[PDB]
Design a protein around this motif. Structure first.
Motif, PDB file in Angstrom:
ATOM      1  N   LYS B 137       0.892  -1.136   0.000  1.00 31.35           N
ATOM      2  CA  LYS B 137       0.000   0.000   0.000  1.00 31.35           C
ATOM      3  C   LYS B 137       0.927   1.181   0.000  1.00 31.35           C
ATOM      4  CE  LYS B 137      -3.763  -1.997   2.644  1.00 31.35           C
ATOM      5  NZ  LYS B 137      -4.049  -2.860   3.829  1.00 31.35           N
ATOM      6  N   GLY B 170      -5.983   0.550  -6.342  1.00 32.90           N
ATOM      7  CA  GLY B 170      -5.133   1.542  -5.694  1.00 32.90           C
ATOM      8  C   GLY B 170      -3.950   1.002  -4.923  1.00 32.90           C
ATOM      9  N   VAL B 171      -3.732  -0.316  -4.998  1.00 34.75           N
ATOM     10  CA  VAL B 171      -2.616  -0.965  -4.338  1.00 34.75           C
ATOM     11  C   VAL B 171      -1.508  -1.182  -5.368  1.00 34.75           C
ATOM     12  CG1 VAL B 171      -4.131  -1.969  -2.600  1.00 34.75           C
ATOM     13  CG2 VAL B 171      -3.454  -3.314  -4.608  1.00 34.75           C
ATOM     14  N   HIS B 172      -0.297  -1.467  -4.881  1.00 38.36           N
ATOM     15  CA  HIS B 172       0.864  -1.483  -5.728  1.00 38.36           C
ATOM     16  C   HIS B 172       1.550  -2.819  -5.848  1.00 38.36           C
ATOM     17  CE1 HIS B 172       0.172   2.715  -4.516  1.00 38.36           C
ATOM     18  NE2 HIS B 172       0.177   2.819  -5.850  1.00 38.36           N
TER      19      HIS B 172
END
Ligand SMILES: COc1ccccc1OC1CN(C(=O)c2cc(=O)[nH]c3ccccc23)C1
Ligand SMILES: COc1ccccc1OC1CN(C(=O)c2cc(=O)[nH]c3ccccc23)C1
Lengths: 304, 304
Positions: B137, B170-172
């Motif tokens: 995150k 929206g997470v990486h």
């Protein structure tokens, strides 16, 4: 996307950290040009801290009593002076890693990065804010004094804080780089209690704008409010009063999201009155107040 | 006292950040010795990302198509190769600021610092963790790819992450410095959904120990539990199962506080079942899981 409690890159400040020892006390110093700044309580023993007369204690100290070490190398002290609650040790060598810098005194609500140091060596970096009661909620252990708080504008480091003390409640007090404490705190081991730690309303609103920009929108409601109505609620919840200056400062975030500042205030009013109901905003179950509107814009735009 | 989400000082890593441009794409590179590491998707256009054949795309690129800039100065590229999902650009100059370094592949639950960069320039530093679903995150915008995650052990930087992509949620996702993605992610613009983001139980317990060390003790109760009983509750709450290896890892924190690991487990079990009741632990209204037991000991002891 994503929103983190982000600190400035610490490299420019790591290059300034030195160890200062006076007698048996060792703490950190900030080496800028040919001056090393450090808390004046480096001259105290634990017994001195109860009721220290710094001017009298300083008379017993000469330049050679201040041991300044930058990495594994010793710096020669050619002068010393006390300015408020800091000592300025003039050394014979200008710090070759001195960045472009300014000394600034910040206002409550403003955020900064802290480079926690021990024995002149950096241990970590974290972000914090000058609280409305002039304390900071830092993370400091024995030997951390002289660690500094700063902001960076491209290549200029604005130093705003130097760490001096921890109150019995676990919160921290310190000075600007002119040696003036933030708030009413003094460098003495005496009864010093912090005032109300109110919530920085303008920062909460900025963080709610960050949440909308990053996709968390559940808290947006169909209401609006006025500054006066919002402030009645803010007072009840120990939040700082919101002013028209704060509304103006939130203008760019209002423009980016299309959410009027007073509409965001009404969403915040409902969150205060109803709570979160077990929900989160940007991975937090409480309303975060240590991001300024400038921090939100900076993080959401990628300023380097 | 005080406990903050603390990142490592970023200076050693700032000295390694460069800008890499291929055609119209610009991202960050990591310059160590005479090699610059960067995501292989630097060779892609937005249309290529839908279904890229990296080996085929790379055939159309020569050394002179990779523009590497360190500050305002250009580096000469004398070789290039693809290793998994990273490119290694051999340059004619060794980075003079190369710190002592290792490339490590971390396991879920482990934390690291990220130096978010844009155009080869550092913008901020924050702490995060490799989630149990192999996402992080983070806080990344357009141009952040090639930013790295690392840990520092005194003077050795262990690089563990290089940023590659953001999922629709929206997470990486990213790779280790050998170019292997963490988890099942691929460098393609395709349907890639993250699995359950479970809570890192051992980290929550470490953070509860940090809370006791820092004076927050309201959550301590009169109960104990067993690993099996605790794990029944952990499963119900999407927490990772606690193993005897985790209990052993918490030994030093158990010794420092005098609170047996299984007693802390029983406190955590009650917090899961009853909630916080509007209370906070270390300024958080949720159970924090991005501090490892090593992080807690490090922060509570002042390792530099
Ligand atoms: C008796 O010393 C003081 C008393 C009152 C005032 C100042 C005194 O000294 C200075 C305080 N300081 C520390 O190193 C320190 C700072 C800190 O933020 N946290 C700590 C936690 C645990 C042990 C020490 C510290 C030196
Ligand atoms: C179309 O590009 C991709 C598609 C699928 C996969 C990769 C693609 O490229 C790379 C992704 N990246 C970015 O710069 C990026 C990374 C990030 O974490 N956040 C962002 C937010 C907003 C805009 C961009 C980003 C380049």
């Amino acid at each position: 996307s994503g929103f983190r409690k982000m600190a400035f890159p610490s490299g420019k400040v790591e290059g300034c950290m030195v160890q200062v020892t006076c007698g048996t006390t060792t703490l950190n110093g900030l080496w800028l040009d040919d001056v090393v700044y450090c808390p004046r309580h480096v001259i105290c023993t634990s017994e001195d801290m109860l009721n220290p007369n710094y001017e009298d204690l300083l008379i017993r100290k000469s330049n050679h009593n201040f041991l300044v070490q930058a990495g594994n190398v010793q710096l020669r002290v050619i002068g010393h002076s006390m300015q408020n609650c800091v000592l300025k040790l003039k050394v014979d060598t200008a710090n070759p890693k001195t960045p472009k810098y300014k000394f600034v005194r910040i206002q409550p609500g403003q955020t900064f990065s802290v480079l926690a140091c021990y024995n002149g060596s950096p241990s970590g970096v974290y972000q914090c804010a000058m609280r409305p009661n002039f304390t900071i909620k830092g993370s400091f252990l024995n030997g951390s004094c002289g660690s500094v708080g700063f902001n960076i504008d491209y290549d200029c480091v604005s130093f705003c804080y130097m760490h001096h003390m921890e109150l019995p409640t676990g919160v921290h007090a310190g000075t600007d780089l002119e040696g003036n404490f933030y708030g009413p705190f003094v460098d003495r081991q005496t009864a010093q209690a912090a005032g109300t730690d109110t919530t920085i309303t303008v920062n909460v609103l900025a963080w709610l704008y960050a949440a909308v920009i990053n996709g968390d929108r559940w808290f947006l409601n169909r209401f609006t409010t006025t500054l006066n109505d919002f402030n009645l609620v803010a007072m009840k919840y120990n939040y700082e009063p919101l002013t028209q200056d704060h509304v103006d400062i939130l203008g760019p975030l209002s423009a980016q999201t299309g959410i009027a500042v007073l509409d965001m205030c009404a969403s915040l009013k409902e969150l205060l009155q109803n709570g979160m109901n077990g929900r989160t905003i940007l991975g937090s179950a409480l309303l975060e107040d240590e991001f300024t509107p400038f921090d939100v814009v900076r993080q959401c735009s990628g300023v380097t």
